[PDB]
Write a protein that holds these residues in place. Structure first.
Motif, mmCIF file in Angstrom:
data_model
loop_
_atom_site.group_PDB
_atom_site.id
_atom_site.type_symbol
_atom_site.label_atom_id
_atom_site.label_comp_id
_atom_site.label_asym_id
_atom_site.label_seq_id
_atom_site.Cartn_x
_atom_site.Cartn_y
_atom_site.Cartn_z
ATOM 1 N N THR A 72 0.812 -1.206 0.000
ATOM 2 C CA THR A 72 0.000 0.000 0.000
ATOM 3 C C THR A 72 0.852 1.264 0.000
ATOM 4 O O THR A 72 0.305 2.368 0.097
ATOM 5 N N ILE A 73 2.169 1.124 -0.171
ATOM 6 C CA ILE A 73 3.141 2.209 -0.018
ATOM 7 C C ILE A 73 3.451 2.805 -1.386
ATOM 8 O O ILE A 73 3.720 2.071 -2.345
ATOM 9 N N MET A 74 3.357 4.135 -1.490
ATOM 10 C CA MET A 74 3.611 4.874 -2.725
ATOM 11 C C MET A 74 4.958 5.601 -2.757
ATOM 12 O O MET A 74 5.593 5.648 -3.813
ATOM 13 N N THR A 75 5.418 6.175 -1.633
ATOM 14 C CA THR A 75 6.625 7.007 -1.584
ATOM 15 C C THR A 75 7.529 6.597 -0.426
ATOM 16 O O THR A 75 7.042 6.275 0.658
ATOM 17 N N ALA A 76 8.851 6.637 -0.645
ATOM 18 C CA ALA A 76 9.851 6.379 0.397
ATOM 19 C C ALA A 76 11.055 7.290 0.181
ATOM 20 O O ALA A 76 11.182 7.936 -0.860
ATOM 21 N N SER A 77 11.951 7.346 1.171
ATOM 22 C CA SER A 77 13.103 8.243 1.070
ATOM 23 C C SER A 77 14.222 7.793 2.000
ATOM 24 O O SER A 77 13.992 7.099 2.993
ATOM 25 N N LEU A 78 15.441 8.221 1.663
ATOM 26 C CA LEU A 78 16.611 8.071 2.520
ATOM 27 C C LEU A 78 17.023 9.453 3.011
ATOM 28 O O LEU A 78 17.460 10.301 2.222
ATOM 29 N N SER A 79 16.872 9.680 4.305
ATOM 30 C CA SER A 79 17.225 10.945 4.915
ATOM 31 C C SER A 79 18.514 10.781 5.707
ATOM 32 O O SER A 79 18.803 9.708 6.243
ATOM 33 N N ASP A 80 19.291 11.857 5.767
ATOM 34 C CA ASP A 80 20.549 11.855 6.499
ATOM 35 C C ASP A 80 20.262 11.980 7.992
ATOM 36 O O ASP A 80 19.117 11.883 8.438
ATOM 37 N N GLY A 81 21.315 12.185 8.785
ATOM 38 C CA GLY A 81 21.129 12.397 10.209
ATOM 39 C C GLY A 81 20.252 13.594 10.524
ATOM 40 O O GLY A 81 19.535 13.597 11.527
#
Ligand code: SF4
Ligand code: SF4
Ligand code: SF4
Ligand code: SF4
Ligand code: SF4
Ligand code: FES
Lengths: 127, 166, 127, 196, 384, 180, 240
Positions: free
Chosen positions: C51-60
């Motif tokens: 059911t997931i549309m968007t994801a991301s890799l965020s820094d500290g």
């Protein structure tokens, strides 16, 4: 309109009202018990507005089992109202946040609000 | 003598009253017509013991407040209740009776428990006739001493046994 | 055509790769948004595997250095997109049958995605 | 046919004629001419007196001549002796400090309970009424409910642990004088009408 | 004997207070006292959304509730310029005539029990129970059903409604004919009702007795013909009438009305072809619930519509309709806000009550109850 | 019309000999139509995730103001709803509730849907304010019914039967027409 | 003073007045996203478009009433069919990439985007035509979501409609340029390299943002806009 008693002082409010009422005949007066939370009376607090028709008398929220001796103070109060011949007893339901400012509104506004929101009540529920 | 002071006798008299529950309707609004439907030839409150229906208040133990109770009707209903024989119970039918309902205004009492000691509440708008039968079985088993609230407490057989009438 | 099913499967695959890189490098991964066609579907059926549309890799610091998105179930010209914020870098992956997930004509391998993510981390990540 | 003669008679004497493109017609008579004019209307053959509706324009976004306005509804039954079917309204404004208006009870016995109701709900006193007694509001009720200066009197709704609702602060819908929750209301939420 | 027939006692249906000034077995004059059911719709409605008010319309006349629903819907449609689909219109007329039959059933049962015998109440209520099963089938509610909408109706009919409606339309002619066979050839009811209930049309007009007891006195005025609104203009229609208004003629007129209503239902069911069900204007109608997961406009409009609602133009409006108790209508003042500025209701049960002291003037004391039951009052409508 | 007395007696005799018509609740389960307005249920997605995203639209559409919705932020580790928002507190005062269905009608996620239970009569005002965990599809029965089945040890039997449950009630288990 | 006419009404108005303010001073209405009180109007949302005549001499193209000055004896049209059609189209362009969060959006009942949408959008085209809400059937802009910019402020770059309100304010009123766009085209998004949000007046952008982009972290997910009880009062923390 007169305001006697002080909040959270059941016996002081009761004695002040005992003194201030005197021999006033309550045959045509209307007794408004202002409280919150219709269902739960065990932790309920009560204020009183006495509308004689010629002048009104306010007592702040200092009665009811919410305060020590406040339950017996409310019982004695309603008993004395009935003894003086009061028949028209009403219960008004206001929000907790209202209850404080409602006694700081001007007399005409406070009384019109109370008369609009008051429900006919069996005084026995306070005995 | 109130049906008390013997282990067998009180259960027997409670049995008797529970099955002989005598409804006295206090029709106010459309809740009253949905209660009249609880008597027709599809679903009748005429089996458990509620066949007869005496309009007089001197003759019934159960007072069923069916409809919105206007503040002008409150003293009338009050005195109709006070003019009942003492082993008496109160059912509050519908949202307008139980709470203020969708009519939250100067005209309607926001809880009939204000004027009369209410025994049973039955929500709905209108409450289905079968919900009313569930309420009367509820009151039946209540006067049988078989009724408990969500807190675990057993409920007294008769409300209006606990009030200082005056 | 029927490429949609394997597209969402490879979408789940790429999400798995992102989670693995996050756990390995000790860098924050975030599920950014779910499918509106799954939230607001009330009785309507949902056949998509996730059911997931968007994801991301965020820094500290939480500011992303890598963003990945998939087209909704009902949109035209379905694709999967990648973006490097602040780097004006955008990638458009499709799925070719038999070959696999490809950026244009160039196969999109897990190793390729890992190298891209490592470069993005080292360059863009503030902390 | 009798409505055409009503419009012609009202226009010649300077009586405003309000009309919406939906098919509703008003004839607003002044306080003086009200009684005698509507007597003449009954004389014209207006068998049936449908309604007496009181209006409090206190909270209306646009101003009006007087706070209160009473609207009568006159009809002539089509299936009776000579029935045209002409039905129309008569509006009469009433000052805040002069809640007076002559009754038409003598004309139609229908106006009896309707004018008693208008007196109950608004402080509007109807002159010449057989019995102006409070009809609907409790005998001990103080004031007149339907004039906007009279509170609706709501009671809070109750939930489990201190959780309550105050409807007057819970309402998302806006009135005409309510600005809205944004900086302003325009467009549809300042009034909307489709072109059939 | 200024006798006080109290509220709800003794068995005066439609709680009312009566000061019967009366010496003997006659009825000199009844002083009516009402207000025991006053709820304050005309004020409470000023603080509700137009959509919210559809929950408030059935609850005043709770027997013929869909007439309230239809009058209010039509007035708002006129005010904001809405277009009603033809199939939605046909469904609306069917529901209105069905609730009319239910109300007529309850009225006649209550009258016969009020004076007369108890038995014939049950057959009328069995047919009413079949009607209520139809209402549950369609709306999920017995009465107070929230089905009508400003655009049209809430949603479409299930498959099972039409077969059960045909079943009832086939059983009803015999049933209504049975009620007529019992009543019209009245053994005792004749000598009880023929004389009582003096209704001169002039006094009915002067006091404004419009509510279905007027044609029993020989006045041919029905709104469905004089001012056709919901397409009744397109129906083959017989209007029953009475010679001299009494309880007998009132009751028989209403029975013929029930048969005519059954014929209207059959006609409308025959002219029914599939189509759309409500005005697609999004300012009026919430977006379709299926694309609430696709369109920003859908979501915004859904959110805004279900929270604030919509704003009709500034203006006053009124539309008349014919219910099982006479002329009904809503005078609506809208100020361009999401809640109506004021809603006044013309109550036919209220205007009809002015003719009670006259109607029961000089009549019998037992007949004072029958003459009240025959006038078909509803105190939810009167007090309001 | 002396004949009418005899005809009346005759038809009453015919209907006397007509025995059947009635339904004996609770001994016979009441037949309800599929669209009936019953106990509110909160529905879950096939994932098991709740549909309710706590958007207070059911409370905003409430004409009796009977719905209290306190929202909260979904926890990625153990999610509750489909978005970033779910129903932390969902209370409905059945004594204030007037049973419109406007809450469901405003429900964008199909969480709140009226059910089929009607046996909800109870003794105390404060017990008739139903909470979320009294309305989830997993629950079988009303509050007094369940309380009786617990203080009794005798399982809950609902007093209704239906031809089928509506799709919006997906997950809501009920006795259906004799399918069981 | 300058003489203006708005669609049926005559207005006196001081010379330095904006056409938009002359419109509202006449009592009419027009969409408003980019401009804000006490902030420099610059035509960005292109919502305030009206018609202007200065003779019958109508201007060729629509005037942005937010950045259009007023001239003596000027006619302004806000009710033309073409004007309302252009308003609806601009509303659609603004709604193009919005994330579909209204029910779960903390901006709730008071969203300028929501309200101007429901006010001016979906113009009446000419029957019972079945109309379409959205024509755009492609993938919407998906960027970083619910990013805490500071202990007090959260940022949804998807809800941003790329007006200029927050950066304009940050440059003008406090004088702390701690927020600005990064990329361009449709890839434009709000960001900062000054992360703490140093300005002691940062929280006002939460009130300014017409959408749920910039929201209040200290009050996130507490209640919907209409549900809260508003107590207007004065702050006694300092003597201003
Ligand atoms: S709860 Fe509903 S059915 Fe009962 S009196 Fe009130 S409006 Fe009528
Ligand atoms: S069904 Fe009950 S909870 Fe839902 S909107 Fe109506 S009154 Fe409110
Ligand atoms: S409307 Fe539906 S999704 Fe929204 S809060 Fe209510 S039950 Fe939950
Ligand atoms: S910013 Fe406005 S339009 Fe967008 S999701 Fe939030 S409330 Fe809806
Ligand atoms: S974040 Fe908000 S205020 Fe800033 S540019 Fe975007 S829409 Fe305008
Ligand atoms: S309002 Fe003038 S362009 Fe934004």
């Amino acid at each position: 309109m007169v305001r006697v008693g002080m909040r959270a002082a059941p016996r002081v409010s009761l004695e002040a009202l005992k003194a201030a009422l005197g021999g006033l005949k309550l045959s045509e007066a209307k007794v408004y018990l202002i409280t919150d939370w219709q269902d739960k009376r065990d932790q309920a607090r009560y204020a009183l507005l006495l509308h004689t028709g010629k002048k009104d008398l306010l007592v702040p929220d200092a009665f009811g089992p919410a305060f020590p001796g406040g339950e017996e103070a409310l019982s004695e109060l309603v008993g004395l109202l009935l003894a003086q011949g009061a028949r028209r007893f009403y219960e008004a339901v206001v929000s907790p946040g209202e209850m404080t400012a409602l006694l700081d509104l001007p007399p005409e506004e406070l009384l019109k609000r109370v008369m609009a929101i008051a429900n006919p009540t069996d005084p026995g529920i306070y005995l | 003598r109130e049906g008390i002071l013997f282990t067998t006798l009180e259960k027997l008299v409670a049995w008797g009253r529970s099955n002989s529950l005598w409804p006295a309707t206090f029709g106010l609004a459309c809740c009253a017509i949905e209660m009249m439907a609880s008597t027709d030839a599809r679903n009748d409150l005429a089996r458990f013991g509620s066949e007869v229906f005496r309009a007089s208040p001197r003759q019934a133990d159960v007072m069923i407040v069916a409809g919105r109770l206007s503040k002008k009707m409150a003293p009338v209903m009050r005195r109709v209740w006070e003019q009942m024989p003492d082993p008496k119970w109160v059912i509050s039918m519908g949202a307008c009776a139980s709470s203020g309902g969708m009519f939250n205004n100067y005209a309607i009492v926001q809880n009939v428990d204000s004027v009369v000691p209410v025994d049973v509440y039955v929500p709905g708008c209108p409450p289905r006739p079968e919900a009313l039968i569930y309420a009367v079985m509820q009151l039946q088993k209540k006067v049988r001493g078989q009724a408990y609230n969500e807190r675990g407490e057993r409920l007294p057989p008769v409300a209006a046994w606990k009030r200082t009438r005056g | 055509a029927s490429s949609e099913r394997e597209l969402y499967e490879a979408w789940v695959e790429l999400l798995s790769w992102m989670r693995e890189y996050a756990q390995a490098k000790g860098v924050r991964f975030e599920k950014e948004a779910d499918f509106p066609d799954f939230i607001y579907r009330m009785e309507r059926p949902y056949d998509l595997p996730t059911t997931i549309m968007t994801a991301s890799l965020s820094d500290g610091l939480g500011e992303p250095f890598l963003l990945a998105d998939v087209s909704p179930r009902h949109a035209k010209l379905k694709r999967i997109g990648l973006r490097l914020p602040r780097a004006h870098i955008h990638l458009h992956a499709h799925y070719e049958p038999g070959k696999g997930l490809v950026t244009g004509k160039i196969p999109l391998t897990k190793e390729r995605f890992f190298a891209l993510a490592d470069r993005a981390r080292e360059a863009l990540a503030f902390a | 046919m009798r409505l055409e003669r009503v419009l012609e008679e009202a226009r010649a004497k300077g009586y405003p004629i309000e009309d919406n493109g939906l098919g509703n017609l008003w004839v607003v008579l002044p306080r003086e001419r009200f009684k005698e004019e509507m007597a003449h209307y009954k004389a014209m053959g207006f068998n049936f007196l449908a309604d007496i509706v009181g209006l409090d324009y206190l909270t209306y976004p646009d101003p009006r001549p007087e706070r209160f306005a009473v609207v009568y509804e006159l009809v002539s039954l089509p299936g009776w002796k000579d029935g045209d079917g002409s039905r129309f309204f008569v509006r009469v404004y009433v000052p805040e400090e002069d809640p007076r208006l002559p009754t038409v009870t003598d004309l139609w016995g229908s106006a009896n309970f309707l004018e008693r109701e208008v007196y109950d709900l608004f402080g509007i006193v109807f002159e010449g009424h057989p019995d102006l007694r409070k009809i609907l509001t409790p005998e001990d009720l103080e004031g007149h409910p339907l004039r906007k200066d009279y509170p609706l009197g709501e009671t809070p709704t109750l939930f489990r642990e201190g959780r309550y609702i105050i409807p007057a602060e819970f309402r998302a819908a806006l009135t005409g004088k309510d600005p809205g929750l944004t900086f302003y209301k325009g467009g549809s939420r300042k009034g909307y009408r489709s072109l059939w | 004997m200024t006798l006080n027939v109290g509220p709800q006692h003794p068995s005066t249906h439609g709680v009312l207070r009566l000061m019967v000034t009366l010496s003997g077995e006659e009825v000199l004059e009844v002083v009516p006292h009402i207000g025991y059911l006053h709820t304050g719709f005309e004020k409470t409605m000023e603080h509700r959304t137009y959509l919210q008010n559809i929950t408030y319309t059935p609850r005043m006349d709770y027997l013929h509730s869909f007439a309230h629903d239809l009058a209010y819907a039509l007035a708002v449609e006129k005010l904001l310029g809405a277009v009603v689909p033809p199939r939605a219109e046909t469904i609306r007329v069917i529901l209105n005539e069905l609730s009319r039959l239910a109300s007529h059933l309850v009225f006649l049962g209550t009258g016969l029990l009020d004076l007369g015998a108890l038995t014939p109440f049950f057959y009328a209520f069995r047919e009413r129970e079949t009607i209520l099963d139809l209402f549950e089938w369609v709306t999920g509610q017995r009465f107070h059903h929230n089905y009508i909408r400003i655009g049209g109706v809430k949603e479409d009919l299930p498959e099972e409604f039409v077969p059960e409606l045909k079943k009832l339309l086939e059983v009803l002619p015999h049933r209504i004919d049975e009620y007529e066979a019992l009543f019209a050839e009245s053994p005792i009811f004749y000598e009880r009702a023929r004389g009582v209930g003096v209704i001169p049309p002039e006094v009915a007009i002067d006091l404004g007795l419009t509510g279905g007891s007027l044609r029993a006195s020989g006045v041919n005025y029905d709104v469905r013909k004089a001012y056709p609104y919901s397409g009744y203009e397109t129906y083959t229609f017989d209007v029953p009438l009475g010679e001299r208004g009494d309880v007998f003629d009132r009751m028989l007129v209403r029975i013929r009305e029930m048969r005519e209503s059954v014929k209207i239902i059959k006609q409308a069911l025959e002219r029914l072809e599939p189509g759309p069900v409500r005005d697609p204007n999004p300012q009026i109608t919430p977006p379709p619930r299926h694309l609430l997961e696709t369109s920003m406009e859908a979501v915004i409009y859904h959110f805004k519509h279900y929270t604030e609602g919509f704003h009709p133009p500034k203006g006053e409006v009124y539309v008349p309709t014919e219910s099982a108790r006479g002329e009904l209508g809503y005078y609506i003042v809208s100020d361009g806000g999401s809640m109506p500025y004021r809603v006044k209701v013309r109550a036919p049960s209220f205007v009809n009550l002015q003719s009670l002291p006259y109607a029961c003037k000089g009549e019998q004391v037992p007949d004072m109850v029958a003459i009240i039951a025959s006038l078909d009052p509803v105190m939810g409508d009167v007090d309001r | 019309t002396l004949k009418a007395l005899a005809q009346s007696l005759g038809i009453t005799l015919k209907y006397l000999f007509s025995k059947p018509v009635t339904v004996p609740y609770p001994d016979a389960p009441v037949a309800l139509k599929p669209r009936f307005h019953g106990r509110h249920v909160l529905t879950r997605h096939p994932n098991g995730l709740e549909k309710c995203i706590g958007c207070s639209l059911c409370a905003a559409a409430c004409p009796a103001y009977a719905i209290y919705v306190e929202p909260a932020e979904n926890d990625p580790e153990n999610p509750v709803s489909a978005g970033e928002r779910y129903a932390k507190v969902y209370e409905i005062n059945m004594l204030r509730c007037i049973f419109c269905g406007l809450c469901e009608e405003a429900c964008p996620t199909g969480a709140i849907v009226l059910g089929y239970d009607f046996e909800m009569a109870d003794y105390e005002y404060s017990d008739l304010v139903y909470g979320k965990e009294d309305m989830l599809v997993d629950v079988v029965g009303t509050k007094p019914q369940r309380r009786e089945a617990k203080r009794t040890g005798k399982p809950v039997k609902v007093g209704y039967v239906v031809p089928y449950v509506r799709p919006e009630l997906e997950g809501f288990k009920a006795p259906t027409e004799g399918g069981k | 003073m300058v003489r203006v006419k708005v669609n049926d009404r005559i207005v006196e108005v001081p010379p330095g007045t904006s056409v938009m303010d002359a419109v509202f001073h006449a009592g009419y209405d027009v969409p408003l996203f980019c401009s804000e009180k006490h902030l420099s109007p610059i035509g960005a949302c292109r919502m305030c478009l009206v018609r202007i005549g200065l003779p019958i001499q109508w201007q060729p193209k629509l005037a942005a009433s937010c950045v259009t000055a007023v001239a003596d004896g000027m006619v302004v049209d806000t009710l033309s069919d073409v004007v309302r059609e252009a308003q609806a189209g601009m509303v659609e362009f603004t709604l193009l990439n919005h994330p579909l969060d209204c029910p779960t959006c903390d901006k709730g009942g008071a969203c300028e985007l929501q309200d101007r949408t429901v006010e001016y959008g979906l113009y009446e085209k000419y029957p019972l035509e079945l109309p379409v809400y959205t024509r755009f059937e492609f993938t919407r802009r998906h960027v970083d979501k619910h990013h805490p910019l500071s202990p007090f402020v959260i940022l949804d770059r998807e809800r941003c409609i790329h007006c200029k309100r927050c950066v304009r304010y940050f440059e003008e009123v406090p004088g702390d340029e701690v927020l600005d766009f990064i990329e361009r085209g449709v890839h434009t998004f709000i960001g900062t390299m000054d992360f703490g949000l140093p300005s002691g007046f940062s929280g006002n952008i939460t009130d300014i943002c017409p959408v749920g982009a910039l929201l209040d972290l200290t009050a996130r997910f507490r209640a919907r806009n209409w549900e809260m009880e508003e107590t207007p009062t004065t702050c006694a923390l300092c003597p201003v």
